[PDB]
Design a protein around this nucleic acid. Structure first.
Lengths: 116, 49, 135, 52, 51, 211
RNA sequence: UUUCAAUGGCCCGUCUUGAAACACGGACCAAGGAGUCUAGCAUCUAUGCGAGUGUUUGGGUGAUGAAAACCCAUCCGCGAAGUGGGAACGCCCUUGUGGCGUGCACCAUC
RNA sequence: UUGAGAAGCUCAGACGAGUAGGCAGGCGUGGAGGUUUGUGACGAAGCCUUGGGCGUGAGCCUGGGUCGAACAGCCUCUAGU
């Protein structure tokens, strides 16, 4: 079998139309969730900083965001990752704190019974 | 007696482990040189511009 | 590909071959004959010469390079390893962007093979050089 | 000027792009051949198409 | 190496204006019919449907 | 006196700008070399665009006659900048525009001698030529400037005596008229230049003191 | 063009074989009918840039077809890691002749 | 003296079998980009012809007849040539 790439420009267009389709549904919030900053796990790459999967629970507790609130305002949680050093904790705590500064959370209507 | 295969894979990996930083430093040093190797303005070039 | 005309389709290289065809037969210089022969040569037979080789060859032994133009039918690349560039005057088919900037900012000038033909039509006071073909 | 840049200054819209340089500065080969600098040192031209 | 410095700008009614623009350096670039037709040959193949 | 107007695409604008520049050159102020270098970029292209032979004969006459108009203090800078822009742009001209620029250089060659004669009425001739010989030596006849074309100097040698005789039809006084050529032939690093300039030059040692 | 006269003229291809002999294939005509595409490698040439080089996995963008063209974030691949002869040049000066120097590439000598 | 498609023009001498194989330049076909401000119902293409011409040749141009709606030269690209 020989795989051909004639749909390469048609996949590019289809993926872009999905981003536009996604943005139409969720109008003002970002098309991606904020990702942490981590360091790759080798002696070849540990100097580089890249994006992680989600923020650790210890990073969210320091930033002031609970693990149940976090998912609702676009902050992924990684229950697996941990902070073995204070630099990873502070690098990503500041990342969450900056995110909260630039964030507008629209209020939600709440059911409110008469008494009690 | 000579070496063991436990470190042989570690030595070759440590050899290519510096490939990333060597490429990063080579790219970084090149841009510094290009910043220094800028031909002057030749003020007779904005005469009509 | 090397005998009576270049294999190159570059129009401007044909204009240089045309200019040195006139200079080779209307002058009794072996420089014009040597330059014309090297214009027919292929890219493999015209190796680049570094800016460091030009600086080394001119200021070699007794040095006293004076102001003789260095002529190479080829590309003058750059040697970033050398830090101080002397005042050189080189005429070449091509200079790289870094080599041209280093030669100009560090004193001297860069010429084309037609700018030198007007300065030294017989190639007098020229240092004809070549790149090593070992590669 | 921003799309293409100059032969010495980089293009604004193309990162690290400079206009190509020419193998000849002046491309009028007739001007070089028939110049005072060159015609003053050439030996006396033989005839054109010669008699049989 | 010496070319016209500026170019004139024409109005809607085809009349010249007093404004002028310095000739961009791209018009002084080498003209390479060999290179243009080699690149064109390749680029012209880049919208071909398979058969 | 705008330089952009001097290189306009229509001849009417270029002529108007040339006339306005006539007053600008006669101010009692010192223009720096760069100011004249930019001014001579437009003036070179005003001459570069002249179309018919009759116009470019008069245009070169207008540019040459501009020299006495300039203030005496910065008149030398006007000529020295003319020969700088005629050396860096000479090799870029095409074969159909060289004849129009040969005449301009010839008219300016005689414009130097005529200015020498004018200043000789008040000041002594020896110092006037010394000022001009300094201009020739620092400019076109510089030995450290390898890039100055020989076509300009070959033209200057061909017309040096013939344009000096025009300025002094009756008699030519003793002076260092041929000093720039003597310095060039002796100590130039262009073997083609020094082997051919004595052939082109026709210096008359009849008046100059024997060495 | 047909035909006559004079002179000459063994059936083509394949295989065989010094050569042929051969043995094969051929009733005739039309149409179809066989070194192609692709991946890797090496030489050579051209082109671009050059201690660098390679945009097209992808992203950005593209209103006149938007599967094109145009743009490039992070990677990654591949590269980087003294004496003689001699091209060319100047100076001579008995001027040619030769000599005096400077000596590329490359080859010999340490 | 006009004879610079310098890829042109021009002068001179020698030489000419050829399998395998090596090399160069050309002829023709389908389609593509450009071009000829191209040809065509006052007749395109095709076919026919003891009509004529050009080229060493592959081939090409043309008259007459037949015919009825498309087609070609030049530069480049391409191949189920």
């Amino acid at each position: 079998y020989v795989k051909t790439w004639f749909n390469q420009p048609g996949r590019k267009l289809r993926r872009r139309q999905a981003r536009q389709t996604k943005a139409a549904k969720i109008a003002p919030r970002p098309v991606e969730a904020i990702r942490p900053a981590v360091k790759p796990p080798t002696i070849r790459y540990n100097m580089k900083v890249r994006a992680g999967r989600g923020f650790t629970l210890e990073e969210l507790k320091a930033a002031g965001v609970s693990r149940r609130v976090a998912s609702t305002i676009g902050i992924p949680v990684d229950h697996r990752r941990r902070n073995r050093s204070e630099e990873s904790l502070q690098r990503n705590v500041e990342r969450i704190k900056v995110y909260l500064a630039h964030l507008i959370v629209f209020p939600r209507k709440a059911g409110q019974p008469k008494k009690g | 007696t000579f070496v063991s295969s436990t470190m042989v894979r570690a030595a070759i990996r440590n050899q290519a482990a510096q490939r990333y930083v060597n490429r990063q430093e080579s790219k970084l040093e090149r841009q510094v040189r290009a910043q220094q190797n800028v031909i002057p303005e030749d003020p007779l070039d904005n005469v009509f511009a | 590909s090397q005998r009576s005309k270049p294999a190159s389709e570059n129009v401007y290289l044909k204009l240089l071959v045309k200019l040195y065809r006139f200079l080779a037969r209307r002058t009794d210089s072996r420089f014009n004959k040597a330059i014309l022969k090297r214009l027919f040569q292929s890219k493999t037979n015209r190796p680049p010469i570094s800016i460091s080789k030009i600086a080394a060859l001119t200021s070699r032994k007794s040095a006293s390079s004076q102001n003789k133009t260095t002529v190479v039918v080829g590309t003058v690349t750059d040697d970033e390893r050398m830090l101080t560039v002397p005042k050189l005057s080189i005429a070449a088919l091509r200079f790289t962007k870094s080599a041209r900037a280093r030669i100009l900012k560090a004193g001297g000038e860069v010429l084309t093979l037609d700018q030198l033909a007007l300065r030294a039509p017989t190639g007098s006071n020229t240092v004809l050089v070549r790149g090593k073909k070992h590669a | 000027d921003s799309v293409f840049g100059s032969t010495t200054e980089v293009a604004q819209l193309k990162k690290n792009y400079f206009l190509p340089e020419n193998i000849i500065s002046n491309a009028d080969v007739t001007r070089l051949i028939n110049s005072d600098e060159i015609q003053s040192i050439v030996k006396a031209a033989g005839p054109s198409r010669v008699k049989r | 190496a010496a070319a016209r410095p500026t170019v004139s700008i024409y109005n809607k009614d085809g009349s010249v204006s007093s404004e002028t623009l310095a000739l961009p350096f791209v018009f002084k670039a080498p003209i390479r019919p060999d290179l243009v037709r080699s690149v064109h040959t390749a680029v012209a193949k880049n919208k071909r449907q398979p058969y | 006196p705008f330089i952009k107007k001097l290189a306009a695409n229509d001849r009417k604008t270029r002529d108007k700008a040339l006339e306005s520049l006539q007053r600008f050159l006669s101010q009692k102020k010192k223009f720096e070399r760069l100011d004249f270098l930019k001014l001579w970029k437009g003036l070179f292209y005003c001459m570069w665009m002249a179309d018919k032979p009759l116009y470019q004969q008069k245009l070169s006459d207008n540019l040459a006659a501009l020299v006495p108009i300039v203030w005496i203090d910065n008149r030398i800078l006007f000529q020295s900048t003319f020969w700088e822009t005629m050396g860096r742009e000479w090799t870029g001209i095409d074969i159909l525009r060289t004849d129009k620029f040969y005449l301009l250089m010839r008219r300016f060659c005689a414009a130097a001698f005529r200015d020498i004669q004018t200043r000789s009425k008040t000041a002594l001739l020896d110092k006037v030529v010394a000022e001009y010989n300094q201009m020739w030596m620092d400019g076109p006849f510089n030995t450290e400037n390898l890039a100055f074309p020989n076509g300009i100097l070959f033209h200057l040698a061909d017309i040096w005596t013939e344009e000096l005789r025009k300025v002094y039809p009756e008699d030519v006084p003793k002076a260092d008229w041929y000093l720039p050529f003597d310095s060039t032939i002796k100590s130039s690093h262009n073997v083609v230049l020094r082997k051919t300039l004595p052939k082109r030059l026709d210096r008359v040692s009849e008046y100059t003191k024997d060495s």
